[PDB]
Amino acid sequence: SKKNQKLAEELYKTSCQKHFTKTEVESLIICYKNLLEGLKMDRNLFRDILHQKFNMTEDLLMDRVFRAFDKDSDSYISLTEWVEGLSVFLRGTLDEKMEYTFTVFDLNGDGYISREEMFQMLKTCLVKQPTEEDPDEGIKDLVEIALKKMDHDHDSRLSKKDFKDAVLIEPLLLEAFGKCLPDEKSSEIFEYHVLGVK
Amino acid sequence: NQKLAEELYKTSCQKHFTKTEVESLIICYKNLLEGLKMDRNLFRDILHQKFNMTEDLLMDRVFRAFDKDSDSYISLTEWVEGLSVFLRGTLDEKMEYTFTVFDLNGDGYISREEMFQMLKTCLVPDEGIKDLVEIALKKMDHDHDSRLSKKDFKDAVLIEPLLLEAFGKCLPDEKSSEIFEYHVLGVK
Ligand SMILES: [Ca+2]
Ligand SMILES: [Ca+2]
Ligand SMILES: [Ca+2]
Ligand SMILES: [Ca+2]
Ligand SMILES: [Ca+2]
Ligand SMILES: [Ca+2]
Ligand SMILES: [Ca+2]
């Protein structure tokens, strides 16, 4: 409490998160500590949290969300990564969110969401829960629809500019390639129970 | 006149135009009219020439959605209300409209066959369409009855955006919209 208030003062000061108050940071620190199994928040713990708290169930996208959280790529979510991540994930502006979803969707980190990446991401839900018949021609149709709507220069990939321009025009395209933000009900429940909002 | 525009702005359910814009739409309608009323043939030519729709099935369904009283003419009020949704519609307005277009028999469920015929006409081969239909049901059919109820469809909004772009071809593309608003309403 003294422990956590002083930690919260320091993290509120140092963290780049833009949306929690210092008291909310303290609640987030306590929550993190209460969720820890071992000393560090690893992939498997973070996966469980996404599944249980945010109803995400699909392996590829959960891994991509983890990687976006894990800013320094050490395969652990630090306290400051937990706050900063959740700040965007729960409260981000469109701008923040578009940068986040682009990062999720750019599977190899080369700066472009490629046709191939689109196909992998769109197919991954049907790998998990298959239709009776192979769905690949229909996925390819969706990929072409995406490219038609979003690829300005017809090079079969979306630059950051391609994606953000299109999402600003149609914000429903924010998560075009899969669910990587919490639905409104999940978000509300976590805010209410963990942060006391509403 | 102006009086029609005063009356229509007061009376109409359209949500997105100003009274001056309404007046512009009334003048537009009258500038385009060929006889006394806008019938299906004229309405189809407008969809074809100004909004880049090419297929008979699609154009018939858009007509029927604009023709709310099913009298086979597009009244001034229908033209304005339909264009309000069509050019500036909210998500809810657009989903309602797209559901209307796709639910061919008007029973309140999009069936597999309705979805296949309408995706096919919207996206003008069949292998991808047949897949799309199975994908949509797998993703959106909550109660597993092989049909999309209106709730099935509307709950799917924030969950399935690219699938909703497929269905959204009954609305005009951004390019066609912009050009019409620019010419007729004086917008960017
Ligand atoms: Ca880390
Ligand atoms: Ca990439
Ligand atoms: Ca197939
Ligand atoms: Ca491009
Ligand atoms: Ca009528
Ligand atoms: Ca039906
Ligand atoms: Ca159903």
Author numbering:
A (entry chain B): 2 to 199
B (entry chain A): 5 to 128, 136 to 199
Sentences from the paper on this structure:
In calaxin, EF1 and EF2 were composed of the conserved residues for Ca2+ binding that are generally observed as D, D/N, D/N and E at the positions X, Y, Z and −Z, respectively. These residues formed five coordinate bonds with Ca2+, including bidentate coordination by Glu. The position −Z of EF3 was substituted by Asp, which coordinates Ca2+ ion in a monodentate manner. Moreover, we found that another Ca2+ ion is bonded between two calaxin molecules in an asymmetric unit. We found that the crystal structure adopts the different conformations in the C-terminal domains between two calaxin molecules in an asymmetric unit: One molecule is in the open state and the other is in the closed state. Compared with the open state, the closed state exhibited the inward movement of the α7 and α8 helices and reduced the exposure of the hydrophobic surface formed by the α7, α8 and α10 helices (Met122, Leu123, Cys126, Leu127, Ile140 and Val144). The residues (from Phe172 to Cys181), which formed a 3-turn helix in the closed state, relaxed the helical structure, resulting in a 1-turn helix and a longer loop between the α10 and α11 helices in the open state. Phe178 was dragged by the movement of the α7 and α8 helices, which relaxed a part of the α10 helix in the conformational transition to the open state and induced a C-shaped groove with a width of ~10 Å. Calaxin adopts both its open state and closed state in the same Ca2+-binding pattern in which three Ca2+ ions are coordinated to EF1, EF2 and EF3, indicating that its open-closed transition is independent of the Ca2+-binding pattern.
Recently, an axonemal Ca2+-binding protein from ascidian C. intestinalis, named calaxin, was demonstrated to bind to a heavy chain (HC) of outer-arm dynein and tubulin in a Ca2+-dependent manner and to be essential for the propagation of Ca2+-induced asymmetric flagellar bending. Based on the amino acid sequence, calaxin belongs to the neuronal calcium sensor (NCS) protein family. The crystal structure revealed that calaxin was composed of 11 helices and contained four EF-hand motifs. Similarly to other NCS-family proteins, calaxin can be divided into two domains: the N-terminal domain and the C-terminal domain.
